[PDB]
From Swiss-Prot, chain A:
The lineage of its organism: Eukaryota, Metazoa, Chordata, Craniata, Vertebrata. Ubiquitinated; mediated by STUB1/CHIP in the presence of Hsp70 and Hsp40 (in vitro). Heme b binds at residues 106, 397. It is found in: Cell membrane, Sarcolemma; Cell projection, Dendritic spine. It comes from Rattus norvegicus. (6R)-L-erythro-5,6,7,8-tetrahydrobiopterin binds at residues 36, 368-369, 382. This is Nitric oxide synthase 1. Produces nitric oxide (NO) which is a messenger molecule with diverse functions throughout the body. In the brain and peripheral nervous system, NO displays many properties of a neurotransmitter. Inhibitory transmitter for non-adrenergic and non-cholinergic nerves in the colorectum. Probably has nitrosylase activity and mediates cysteine S-nitrosylation of cytoplasmic target proteins such SRR. Inhibitory transmitter for non-adrenergic and non-cholinergic nerves in the colorectum. The chain holds residues 299 to 716 of 1429 of the full protein. L-arginine binds at residues 169, 278-279, 283. Belongs to the NOS family.
Curated annotation (Swiss-Prot), chain B:
This is Nitric oxide synthase 1. Disulfide bonds: none annotated. The lineage of its organism: Eukaryota, Metazoa, Chordata, Craniata, Vertebrata. Produces nitric oxide (NO) which is a messenger molecule with diverse functions throughout the body. In the brain and peripheral nervous system, NO displays many properties of a neurotransmitter. Inhibitory transmitter for non-adrenergic and non-cholinergic nerves in the colorectum. Probably has nitrosylase activity and mediates cysteine S-nitrosylation of cytoplasmic target proteins such SRR. Inhibitory transmitter for non-adrenergic and non-cholinergic nerves in the colorectum. The chain holds residues 299 to 718 of 1429 of the full protein. It is found in: Cell membrane, Sarcolemma; Cell projection, Dendritic spine.
Length: 407, 411
């Protein structure tokens, strides 16, 4: 019942009771751990709604009060009548903040209660979505002083009338397959880029081409829109020591905005809910730039540094990795665009876990995702035992719309 | 039930069937994952089926399943169990069992090597002095003047749990740690408690930063005894940097032979509570963990100072910069002295090949991602991008409580 987690660096031991309130399954069993797998009716809706309202009314200290019972009866009647229901504004904002709070893969959760929620449930068309999204982008960017936000479009109905952002993030760079056989720009987005071209997008065919938005309103075919360039804040990447660094032609965008996930609140499904915060440096400098299947710039950089690339044992890849990540952080800071380094972000996450353990009785955390992709054991989270479990409200993955959509 | 694992960098998909054989439990449930938790007297009743599963595996491995020799062995073991409450492994079975325990060790990135393990049978050992002799021979053999060879020495199995053989050291070779009255630690802070026990047992501590600990050995449930490994048997490597001439003046060295001595080897239900085993190092074990953990030698600051790094803000990545330099130094120093070491790129690349081989030939490879991924430069190694399945197979190595916690002192 009561589970203990220990930090092996500090000997601090926390007791987890919050896991007892988990409903969804992990992928694991008593016989197998799937911890490193990336992807492991009227009757159905009422217990889900009730579970959500009970936690809501408990959060505002009105559990078992009249307003609580009343809301439950009101929902019960709407469910029996329409087969669904509508969240109050207060419940939508609570549900969204809590889905972030419950995101076990997110190191940035110390910030969870400072999320600006934009209710776009009154949206009906792709142009309307474009508008809400531009508004989200400008608000969140805030001239480089980034603020966390989520925009929430209408909830799923019959499943043939879904709102979807087809982009994986609101702002991402194009990827093109080449006559050479290699890839110009971002290889992660080769397929999406093709679809955009297939939809009529005139591709500049460069290394850092901001992708158009491809927006699906109410089950209809999606539509292309160019985000106003002045709304897309970008950072040229230079190094505080190396004068040649700027010549690599590197830049990245300031706003990380996940747009392909599904927000589940009290059994209601929000299939278009783009949300955004600000970057941890390693997401760009380690993953975006140095993954072999991404920009893969390690060879180039270590070349310019005149390193010994003969043997893996000179740690040429590791040396270059560090300089690149220094550059990313230096650039964003120099341009006054919010960014956090992995030391600061992980330190804050430990403080957050501590807060959550004493205030809420736990914090679901996925160690495989929380520990940064460089310098793991020099960050405090490496030495932190974590319990992973699934609480609702939540953000979930969903299939890429092009495998689902019927044209 | 077939389970797929994908490499997200290469798109290679593998199918696991081996996990079906798994009997033991993980710590996880359908509702909770304990994948990052460090630690999530047997009767005839339970012993014969444990013996049977094991001998079934063994006789299948040698292509003699269902043979007369297979059947006669099961009968002989069954008879030995009913008569004596336990049984003795043949030498061939002990070798197979020890190799399999390593093969099954889900936290071990070095398992490509599993079939080359030198097994030393020390089941005729009776005293601590006998243990010390077996251990010196293991160290000399394994060390091989820098050309390290993997080995394990297996002392007599548990009987009633009151006559246990134990190596009280966590590793055969490790440096003393000394807590000072001002609250600082001299040497390795990981070994302060064990160092105290040694001193109480009568060890005269030289009180330096890298004193090789004496062996503390327990035979047949008796009180443990102290022994100094001959220094000529302990290969050490002074750490220097190929470019930074001041690195040598930090005064760092490490030993060449990593030899775990506190785990329990389980084979066919028998428990070998003293089974020291050794391989060779992956650099990050020394360079990242032993040197740079805050709770270990903690040299990041001092190295960063000597490199004149900007230490005013974490975002200068001064810790990351120093970290890489230290690890370059460890590898350089070992290679220059012709002492076997593997870097984390090569070891992880080799592990992916091993794992793919295992899936093809064995139907699976249990692996603990949390442990397999190196403690620096995670995602620039191919294991970061490899989905893994963790489950428990026997024969196995298991943790056991530190013996000072459980031992009954005779006096
Ligand atoms: C405010 C600053 C934030 C930081 C520094 C941050 C950081 C991160 C990082 C490093 C990851 C791991 C992703 C990866 O490495 O590929 C992550 C994942 C995630 N984040 Fe946060 N995040 C922030 C804000 C947010 C917000 C505002 C939300 C939603 C309201 C959110 C929800 C999530 C979710 C659902 C995941 C898991 C996504 C997946 O499984 O791919 N984050 N975040
Ligand atoms: C041949 C060279 C070897 C290499 C490079 C190697 C490497 C490693 C590494 C890096 C770890 C992770 C532990 C840590 O970082 O704290 C590990 C763990 C482990 N290794 Fe290997 N190893 C080797 C040989 C062996 C041998 C010979 C055995 C037994 C016969 C073995 C059994 C284990 C076990 C049981 C663990 C888990 C330790 C624990 O859970 O505390 N290894 N090894
Ligand atoms: C809101 C926010 C802020 C910050 N700083 N950071 C984030 C994480 C996103 C940005 N950087 C990557 C990550 N979002 C990508 C989510 N999945 C990609 C990996 C993947 C591929 C295939 C199948 C899978 F199941 C998963 C979100
Ligand atoms: C045989 C061999 C070769 C190599 N290269 N490497 C190894 C792993 C050991 C050496 N370097 C670290 C590791 N063994 C260190 C201690 N292991 C137990 C971890 C632990 C600590 C506290 C509580 C727990 F539950 C568990 C073995
Ligand atoms: C196979 C493995 O689960 C996969 O590579 C994971 C590992 N940890 C990760 N951690 C983060 N933060 N982001 C990722 O994309 C991944 N990828
Ligand atoms: C809390 C966490 O499980 C613990 O720090 C683990 C993480 N991964 C590890 N991986 C290895 N190889 N060795 C370790 O000691 C650890 N420590
Ligand atoms: Zn698990």
């Amino acid at each position: 019942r009561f589970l203990k987690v220990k930090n092996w660096e500090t000997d601090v031991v926390l007791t987890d009771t919050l896991h007892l309130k988990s409903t969804l399954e992990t992928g694991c069993t008593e016989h197998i751990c799937m911890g490193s797998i990336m992807l492991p009716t009227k009757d159905q809706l009422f217990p889900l709604a009730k579970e959500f309202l009970d936690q809501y009314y408990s959060s505002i200290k009105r559990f078992g009060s009249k307003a609580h019972m009343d809301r439950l009866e009101e929902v019960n009647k709407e469910i029996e009548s329409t087969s669904t229901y509508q969240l109050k504004d207060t419940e939508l904002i609570y549900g969204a903040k809590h889905a972030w709070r419950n995101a076990s893969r997110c190191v940035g959760r110390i910030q969870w209660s400072k999320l600006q929620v934009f209710d776009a449930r009154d949206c009906t068309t792709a142009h309307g979505m474009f508008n809400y999204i531009c508004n989200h982008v400008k608000y969140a960017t805030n001239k480089g002083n980034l603020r966390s936000a989520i925009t929430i479009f209408p909830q799923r109905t019959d499943g043939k009338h879904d709102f979807r952002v087809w982009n994986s993030q609101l702002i991402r760079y194009a990827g093109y397959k080449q006559p050479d056989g290699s890839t110009l720009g971002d290889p992660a987005n080769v397929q999406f880029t093709e679809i955009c071209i297939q939809q009529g997008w005139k591709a500049p065919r460069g290394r850092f081409d901001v992708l158009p938005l491809l927006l699906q309103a109410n089950g209809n075919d999606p539509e292309l829109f160019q985000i106003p360039p002045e709304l897309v804040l970008e950072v040229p990447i230079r190094h505080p020591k190396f004068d040649w660094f700027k010549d690599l032609g590197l830049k990245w965008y300031g706003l990380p905005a996940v747009s392909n996930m599904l927000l589940e609140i009290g059994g209601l499904e929000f299939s278009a809910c783009p949300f955004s915060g600000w970057y941890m440096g390693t997401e760009i400098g380690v993953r975006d730039y140095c993954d072999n299947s991404r920009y893969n710039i390690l060879e180039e950089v270590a070349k310019k540094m005149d390193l010994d690339m003969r043997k893996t044992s000179s740690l040429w890849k590791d040396q270059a990795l560090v300089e690149i990540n220094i550059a990313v952080l230096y650039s964003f800071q120099s341009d006054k665009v919010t960014i956090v380094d992995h030391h600061s972000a992980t330190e804050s996450f430990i403080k957050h876990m501590e807060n959550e353990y004493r205030c809420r009785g736990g914090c679901p955390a996925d160690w495989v995702w929380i520990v940064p992709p460089m310098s793991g054991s020099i960050t405090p989270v490496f030495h932190q035992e974590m319990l992973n479990y699934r609480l609702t409200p939540s953000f979930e993955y969903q299939p890429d719309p092009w495998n689902t959509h019927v044209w």
